[PDB]
């Protein structure tokens, strides 16, 4: 019940919900260990994201990570960058 363990449980809960939805939508069930695997994978991904974001902001002489930093994170996939971009302009109002 440490600090990171509470973080891992939190994402694991959200991953569970997310997978439940995908499971009902596609009439395919996920094993417990699969959901847990996706959860740990997601925890590890936040590490890559966080460091890239930091370095991207730093690359732009900034210490505050912005939405351009985030959009760089999604540059690898056309649909992804499109998905994340619109979403960005959506929250910009």
């Amino acid at each position: 019940f440490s600090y990171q363990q509470r973080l891992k449980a939190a994402v694991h809960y959200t991953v569970g919900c997310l997978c439940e939805e995908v499971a009902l939508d596609k009439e395919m069930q996920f094993s417990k260990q699969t959901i847990a695997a996706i959860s740990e994978l997601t925890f590890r991904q936040c590490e890559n994201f966080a460091k890239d974001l930091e370095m991207f902001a730093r690359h732009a002489k900034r210490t505050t990570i912005n939405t351009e930093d985030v959009k760089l994170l999604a540059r690898r996939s056309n649909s992804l960058l499109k998905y994340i971009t619109d979403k960005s302009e959506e929250i910009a109002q």
């Binding site: 997310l18 094993s31 699969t34 939405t67």
Partner: protein, 74 residues
């Protein structure tokens, strides 16, 4: 369903190498969306793989097959 931005903030800050590093509210909301897409993409690809193998359910073995490409897309 979706991630609490509070949780996402705690996840990111756990890994910043500089203590001076911060993330804007909008970037946080975006990351909340990005994390969701990441998880869903992993799940949908898991299912597609299970269907290809005529599996009963998405097991770890099927998931492990779709991981390599997923990581390269993100």
């Amino acid at each position: 369903s979706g991630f609490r931005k509070e949780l996402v903030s705690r996840l990111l800050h756990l890994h910043f190498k500089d203590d001076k590093t911060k993330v804007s509210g909008d970037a946080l909301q975006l990351m909340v969306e990005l994390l969701k897409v990441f998880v869903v993409e992993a799940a949908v690809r898991g299912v597609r793989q299970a269907q290809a193998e005529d599996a009963l359910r998405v097991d770890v073995d099927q998931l492990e097959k779709v991981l390599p490409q997923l990581l390269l897309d993100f």
